[PDB]
Design a protein around this ligand. Structure first.
Ligand SMILES: C[C@@H](Oc1cc(-c2cccc(S(C)(=O)=O)c2)cnc1N)c1cc(F)ccc1N1NC=CN1
Length: 284
């Protein structure tokens, strides 16, 4: 059984909370291996490992379990436990009834039939807080993007959390190029400033209300665009103060990009600014 180290502490499969299979009930699919809504009553999202898999897939699954179980922060999805001693094997996560952030943005965007700038700034703050936690614990996420974030509920009290760690698990042992800084896809150098760049792209995703980054551009086109200094324009109706956070996250030199403490400070300032939060989002 392979070990996992986070924050200088070492854990193993034995440290995972094994939940008796008989105590676990599947309710319905949530999409995808496959993920189900379940009960243990505690509501859970149940990630499954296909029984037809390689020994490598099984190690990947175990490592994902260790990674999430060892985090402790309000903006990172909780792991209730695992069921690894029955097949198919389960990882049990906090059920985020709001679903993934990218689909939420698409589905909840203002129309003649609702969201405000403050809703978006709150999502941004939430994820930035999670990223700050990762940064201060020297963990590089490597794939900070709307598709990897979840919401506790559809309504105003929603809290956003980072909910997937598959890329980080792979690296611990298909590239998200549109979310990566120049030194990452060029030299394969990763640091906390890698996540800062990605957060800038997530910020664009959020204030565009769920558009794919670099509209009309392919991966290689983005690679060449970003490498030569190209940056995305502001999303429709995006306040200048918010766009300026994005452009700071996308500084070419990693040292010129803000850490997440500074990012959080800037998001907070935007939230206070009436001219920012009084700005209406577009209605499609
Ligand atoms: C592993 C999975 O975890 C979850 C999904 C949903 C969740 C996702 C979508 C919709 C709903 S719903 C129908 O209950 O509103 C709940 C709610 N809680 C989770 N803990 C997940 C984590 C992410 F960070 C991003 C996407 C997903 N998936 N995987 C398969 C589907 N989403």
């Amino acid at each position: 059984n392979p070990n996992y180290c986070f924050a200088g502490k070492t854990s193993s499969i034995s440290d995972l909370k094994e939940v008796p299979r008989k105590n676990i009930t599947l309710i319905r699919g949530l999409g995808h291996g496959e993920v189900y809504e379940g009960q243990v009553p505690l509501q859970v999202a149940v990630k499954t490992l296909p029984e037809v898999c390689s020994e490598q897939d099984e190690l990947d699954f175990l490592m994902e379990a260790l990674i999430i179980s060892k985090f402790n922060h309000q903006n990172i999805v909780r792991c209730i436990g695992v069921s690894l001693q029955s097949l198919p094997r389960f990882i049990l996560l906090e059920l985020m009834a709001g679903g993934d952030l990218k689909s939420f943005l698409r589905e909840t965007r203002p129309r003649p039939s609702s969201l405000a700038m403050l809703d978006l700034l709150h999502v941004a703050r939430d994820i930035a807080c999670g990223c700050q936690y990762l940064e201060e614990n020297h963990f590089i996420h490597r794939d900070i993007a709307a598709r990897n974030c979840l919401l506790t509920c559809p309504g105003p009290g929603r809290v956003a959390k980072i909910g997937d760690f598959g890329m980080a698990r792979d690296i611990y042992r298909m590239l998200p190029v549109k979310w990566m800084p120049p030194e990452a896809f060029m030299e394969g150098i990763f640091t906390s400033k890698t996540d800062t760049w990605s957060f800038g792209v997530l910020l664009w995703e959020i204030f565009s209300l769920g558009y794919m980054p670099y509209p009309s551009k392919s991966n290689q086109e983005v690679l060449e665009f970003v490498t030569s200094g190209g940056r995305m324009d502001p999303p429709k109706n995006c306040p200048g103060p918010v766009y300026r956070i994005m452009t700071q996250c996308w500084q070419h030199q990693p040292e010129d990009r803000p850490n997440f403490a500074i990012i959080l400070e800037r998001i907070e300032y935007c939230t206070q600014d009436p001219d920012v939060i009084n700005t209406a989002l577009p209605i499609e």
